[PDB]
Amino acid sequence: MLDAFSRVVVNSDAKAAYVGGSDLQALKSFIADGNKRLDAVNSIVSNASCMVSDAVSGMICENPGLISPGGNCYTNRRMAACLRDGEIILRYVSYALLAGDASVLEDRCLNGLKETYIALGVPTNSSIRAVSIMKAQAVAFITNTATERKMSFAAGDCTSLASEVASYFDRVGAAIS
């Protein structure tokens, strides 16, 4: 797996060149805003079990045929597996937010995720809703635009990290579509 500093190394190992100062200003700025990246990670992992409970049960609201007999989220065994999957997509995105690089989300969580969900028969138009309901809830606490649960941050712009998470949640949505 890779992080934000290691992607700069493995791109300049491919050119047989030392990492000069012309490639350090994307990394010296990374440790400058690195405190407010860590400040915005734990707004996601502390609200995580309410986010998976909202994003699954809002997918039931939009598609009510998931809980019909023969639906995919019908019985109690199939309902708990859907709650377990949305916690896993939230867990691997919150590694990639912490690392600053989408390597580890791609090849442990998204590796063969589409061919698994076809074989199980999981609907792909409802499973992209549950990663997009919680996409909007993950740009909530970064931008502090939450209805309930206001969290005490420090003042400044965090829309770079809010747009980076929205890149990461659509990387899931481009993988299971």
Binding site: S132, K135, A136, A138, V139, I142, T143, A162, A166, D170
Partner: protein
């Protein structure tokens, strides 16, 4: 009966008295009201213009422009007559944003 767009329109009349209380369940072909959709399509297009966290996690597709023949002069190619001197004017009041694009 599906595509014919008819629907039972119910009208209740009540004047308080007992012999004033008809219900009329008649059938009308309802019509797609073209003009009041622009009070919905435009206002939601500027609701979603001003969302900071719905312009990310809901990203729009990459719309191609019209066939503008780059004639060669840049004051017609880059700034055509349909967009000449157009600019948004924002008119705030109490509980209203009210942008407008007009030639200024």
């Amino acid at each position: 009966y599906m595509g014919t767009s008819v629907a039972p329109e119910i009208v209740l009349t009540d004047k308080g008295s007992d012999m004033s209380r008809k219900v009329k369940t008649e059938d009308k072909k309802v019509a797609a009201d073209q003009a009041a959709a622009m009070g919905i399509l435009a206002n939601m297009s500027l609701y979603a213009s001003l969302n900071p966290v719905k312009r990310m996690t809901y990203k729009a597709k990459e719309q191609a422009p019209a066939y503008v023949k780059k004639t060669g002069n840049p004051v017609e190619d880059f700034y055509p007559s349909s967009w000449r001197n157009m600019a948004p004017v924002i008119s705030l009041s109490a509980n209203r944003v009210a942008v407008a694009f007009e030639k200024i």
